[PDB]
Design a protein around this ligand. Sequence first.
Ligand SMILES: Nc1ncnc2c1ncn2[C@@H]1O[C@H](COP(=O)(O)OP(=O)(O)OP(=O)(O)O)[C@@H](O)[C@H]1O
Ligand SMILES: Nc1ncnc2c1ncn2[C@@H]1O[C@H](COP(=O)(O)OP(=O)(O)O)[C@@H](O)[C@H]1O
Ligand SMILES: [Mg+2]
Lengths: 465, 466, 499, 45, 54
Amino acid sequence: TGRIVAVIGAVVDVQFDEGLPPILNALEVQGRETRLVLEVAQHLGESTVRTIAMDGTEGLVRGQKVLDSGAPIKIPVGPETLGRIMNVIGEPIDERGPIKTKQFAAIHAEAPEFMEMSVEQEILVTGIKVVDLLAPYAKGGKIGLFGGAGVGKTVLIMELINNVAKAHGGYSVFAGVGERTREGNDLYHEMIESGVINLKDATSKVALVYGQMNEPPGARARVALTGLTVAEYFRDQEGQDVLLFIDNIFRFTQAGSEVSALLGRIPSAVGYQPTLATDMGTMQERITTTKKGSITSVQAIYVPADDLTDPAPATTFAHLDATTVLSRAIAELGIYPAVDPLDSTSRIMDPNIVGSEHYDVARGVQKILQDYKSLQDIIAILGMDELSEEDKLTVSRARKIQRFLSQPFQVAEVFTGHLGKLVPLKETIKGFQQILAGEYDHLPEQAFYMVGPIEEAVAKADKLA
Amino acid sequence: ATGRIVAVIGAVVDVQFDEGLPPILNALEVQGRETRLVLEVAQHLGESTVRTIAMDGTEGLVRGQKVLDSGAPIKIPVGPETLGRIMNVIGEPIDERGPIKTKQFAAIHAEAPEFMEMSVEQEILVTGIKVVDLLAPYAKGGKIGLFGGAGVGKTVLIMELINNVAKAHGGYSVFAGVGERTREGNDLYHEMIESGVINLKDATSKVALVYGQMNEPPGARARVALTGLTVAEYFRDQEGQDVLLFIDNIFRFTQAGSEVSALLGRIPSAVGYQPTLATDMGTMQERITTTKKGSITSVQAIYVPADDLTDPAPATTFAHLDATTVLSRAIAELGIYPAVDPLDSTSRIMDPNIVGSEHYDVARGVQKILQDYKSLQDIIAILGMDELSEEDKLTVSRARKIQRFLSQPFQVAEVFTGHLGKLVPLKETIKGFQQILAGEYDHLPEQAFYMVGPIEEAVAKADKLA
Amino acid sequence: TTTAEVSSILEERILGADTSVDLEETGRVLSIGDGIARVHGLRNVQAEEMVEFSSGLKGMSLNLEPDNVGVVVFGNDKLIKEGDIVKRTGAIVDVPVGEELLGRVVDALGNAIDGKGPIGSKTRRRVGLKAPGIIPRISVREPMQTGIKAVDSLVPIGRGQRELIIGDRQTGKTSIAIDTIINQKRFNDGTDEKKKLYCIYVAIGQKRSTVAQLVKRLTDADAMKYTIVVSATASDAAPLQYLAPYSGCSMGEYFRDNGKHALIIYDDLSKQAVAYRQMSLLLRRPPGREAYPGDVFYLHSRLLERAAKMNDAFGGGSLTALPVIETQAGDVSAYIPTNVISITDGQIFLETELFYKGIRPAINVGLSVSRVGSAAQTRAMKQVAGTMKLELAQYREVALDAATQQLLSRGVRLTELLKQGQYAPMAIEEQVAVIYAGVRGYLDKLEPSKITKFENAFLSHVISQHQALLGKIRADGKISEETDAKLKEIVTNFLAGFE
Amino acid sequence: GVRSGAGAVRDAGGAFGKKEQADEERYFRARAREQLAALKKHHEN
Amino acid sequence: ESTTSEQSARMTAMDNASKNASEMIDKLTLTFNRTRQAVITKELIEIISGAAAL
Ligand SMILES: Nc1ncnc2c1ncn2[C@@H]1O[C@H](COP(=O)(O)OP(=O)(O)OP(=O)(O)O)[C@@H](O)[C@H]1O
Ligand SMILES: Nc1ncnc2c1ncn2[C@@H]1O[C@H](COP(=O)(O)OP(=O)(O)O)[C@@H](O)[C@H]1O
Ligand SMILES: [Mg+2]
């Protein structure tokens, strides 16, 4: 048991007598109404360890006794963490009683060893036609979800959770790093309405880990690790294809930079921490495909100053395996989900990974869309009669494709009254291949709007006239 | 007097002497090492403790190890026997041909020639390169600099200058390879052996080599230039000869100083450089001068980090040069080799009294038309060529032809592009550029002037693609 | 105050109990943090000597202060505490070396991470040996076939050369290296004993999954048996990433000094530079351009300069280096890229624009050069590649007259010819024949989109029945007049048959 | 996100700013000449 | 005929000018991002050096 000797800002220094705790150890301050957890960051010498705080440091007196927990910050983990909101230190903040689980796990864990890593890229079928076709999600990969509000990002997150739960039988974890309290409450209630989290029975699919903006930088620096530990439990002790969400990774980088600055470490370029690459790697490398299961991370990304070459977005892209961008223009066009079919890219979009047929279909779809963009420019400048019959048929096929990318969502059934569809990858590939082959060129444009498999498209065409 | 090693941090070693502190700039031999690790005293830290800069790797140094003071600065073998030999920073022959049996030794650190010893004679060193001869002519016995980024042509240009001048130079030559590729040094050594400028059999060699390369620790790279400069100083002063001093690259001296100053305990200057950035550079450079005893026609390659001429290291060295040749990456992108910038390279002998009225007029006209074209480049870039006036179109055409005609194949670059190197005389390039400015060749295509020598080659290339 | 002026050391001194503890050979950690551990004691420790902690981690004695020793920890600093006992190993930091590491995936320190057992090394080599001097080196003579048509044709890489693979993200920088690793299989299987090239791959900061998949690709192509994979991934500490290139460099130096030829792939040297910048900034050293230390150029120079070709006096071995530099938005004029360019003997630009358009590999043939590559190129490949390079340059110059139309057509045909698939390196004679087909104007008639199909069929045709001609080309090293006539006849016959 | 504003061509002081200034001056010199001629003709009355 | 040709050529020339301007815009945007990052780094380095030398 140590004593506080320095309360400079959020940095608290504790001097121990008997045994100095190792770095990244959780120290619990005594005499406070709310738990104050200090994480050891340095060994300053003279039996003194410099710690960062996970809560406000007001009311701390030089000489307050601090107990060494004996391990890093350990959070309640298990199947009972689903449908609950917990902060970085693991305390429940949903006012629904204690989270009663069987085991706890330290947030700071080593990345899986070299042998435990999988050696085969595999596509995680999300059930969404646009994602599964043009920008497939690699199992155990990282996805950069571009776009903010007004493009249905939260609806996409809920639908991804529901699809992964229904198809692969794997749970999901949402770790909100620096998430607004108002937006956190809105997302919580929206998820409650969507049914992905249930307050009555144990059918919830999301474990929420919220680090609000009003918390100290140390808390937001470890909220991502807390959510990642929650996902790691499901990956290891249950062998599920977990889905981790980080909203967003840029605030994780910012929290890391603030924590490093508080410790008096000389900043790197554009005012970032020296350990930016190493901290990002230690966070991301735990998101991989082990032999027991896998963790797939869909991380929202905010690009500072709209500069993709800034150190934070560059370091984040160093770990990304695919990108999904929600364009407001597509949403205004009326296509939901608003995933941009052109700007979205996937590293595993290679014939050796997804197969020759899938690669050919996706490349053809993208080529037709680009040709449609060029012909739309021509139509904007010249008249629609200028283009040939081939150009007109390509325009019609591309319109059919871009309306086929739209898909009803189960999470949105209560609102729009349209039944949600979980389109398998084979059905998506077959439908888009048949559309490219000109098989359904006689069907009207609206026959493919907001449908699942192409059979539903032909049924809707039959319904029309 | 023998001391004990107290601190070993990087290339900076701190030694405490029980008695007899060695003065600054004094060599100290470290006892107990298989090689010869010699430390150069830089500071007297007090408490009978000195701070030294090691001339080799500091691996294996134990605190308390005995180091013996040599009692004198780093001295190197110097004399006629150094010709045709390769030396390191501390004057150890690394050509495995035996010891350099010279009758005298010279201290590495010496004072620059005084004001009265300086010479003001100015001539023109015709190098056979169109851009250099026309716009920024070189002066015999004057400092010359070859600025440029990474892989823009500094090494190729300095090798071409060697091939043009040193082989035809009556006097001796000294090459100091500071912080460059070691394979380049091996290639230069074998080229000079083949060409006969270095002979391994009889004492007819004309060029002495000093090599401290990028593999060397920062302590070595900060003093090898001084070794080559000392050899050149001996050849200039004690023999009264005309000597060529080729240095490549001289920026690594400043970079080594910056590397060691962080450990030496100095508050960094701009861009993390040492505060003593201009003082040490001036001390090194002012020794490379033409005194009344002899002339040192020095050609120095200056690396430009991140292609930023405003960086302190390539910026403070402008004042130390008579003729400046600034290569540019943008020109090299267009294929115009050499990449000399005609609107950034300047010379001190570019004056009608020295270089002649016709030469000065031609050079000024070329610079004027190039500047006019560069000013017009923005409108051409945005609107298009068709928006210009007829006179503006004529100026653009003539300036593009001049840009093509500045390019010249090099003999050392023959193995690269396959085009035979051309060595134009001064009068021929003067006449060619005067004719181009006049308008006699306003009907030939632009490509007719690319990678050709005399204008006769341009006119004999134009009709090939008739 | 000072680091060793702490109250505990003062109490030990005044109490007189400074006799039981061995301060000559062991030491106790005063302060562990920021990746640098201050150790009190180790009075007989050496500069750069490797010291092992109580927990098991090993560290390098960087700073030998008068009262303490600054030790950089090759691992996570969590496992190191104040009061931990540090003991000397009596050796400058070295790495196990030899042929016993062939096929083993090791970390920065040489410890096996593939779970195949301990390394059976018998000799250890220092990771910081000086590069060979002027005399031991000789000019680059032997070719180093990569299997890539564009590389082996326009940017030839010699054996002992240092060629930089520079580009942006997802531009095929790693793919070129992997294909080069696979391409050497034909030489290693044979009994030439002078064309064998023992490859080495060093991963600096990249994902563990990527390294595992690369190892799987090498094993599936049966290329692991002659390559060494040194892994220092993102999860690994910054000192491991800093040290990883030097470990692989020493492993290649072993082959270099014993008359054998080796290839080392410093994948992501920019990430090593970032790790070293982190180490320096945590040491509170004055940053410079882009917050980098002032000795990053030395950091890369003392590494790449070790790759060289030795003369027959020193065994005649060699060590070819292919560093990889990641550039942001294609910024060639940046600190680290310009530093590496100033060190290497060439570069292979992989423009993202070409990669997006489908030109794989994305080599920018206009800006990609190889200084010492012409000497280390086979005569037949040189004969075809000179004409190919001239025609491509002329195509780039012009990109309605009949001549310029023909030039543009030939350039398009050659550009489509240079396109190559992945994980399928080609034999030197096969590339010679393919380039001969395009150069001699046997593809001007074909539609540009059919050139790849033509090559896919022509390779199969020649490799199946006309094996004698390829063998003759390989043995001679040049395309003779009789060889020229036979190749012309067969290519014309296949062109007629292709239709 | 980096954006621009109104009248930024002359602020840069490049080729286009000088071109615009010269064009405006040349046009308004002619307009001033015409107005002066008209004013003189009126003043003669 | 002349007015039709002139309008067509005006449209084509304006399109080419717009394309060239966009290319220059993206190049200058990359340069501006580099310069902004350099300025931030330089000012922070100055502040850190001033604080450390105290
Ligand atoms: N020759 C090729 N033909 C087709 N695709 C290729 C080729 N080379 C590489 N690729 C594709 O490029 C992608 C990744 O390339 P690679 O990893 O080699 O590039 P990189 O720039 O080195 O990557 P990173 O920066 O992520 O390490 C894969 O989708 C792969 O299929
Ligand atoms: N005169 C020239 N003609 C053709 N190419 C040249 C010329 N000068 C330089 N180069 C190109 O530059 C490269 C060598 O540049 P180098 O002189 O080493 O520059 P640096 O010394 O700054 O690295 C060669 O690969 C060559 O292609
Ligand atoms: Mg050079």
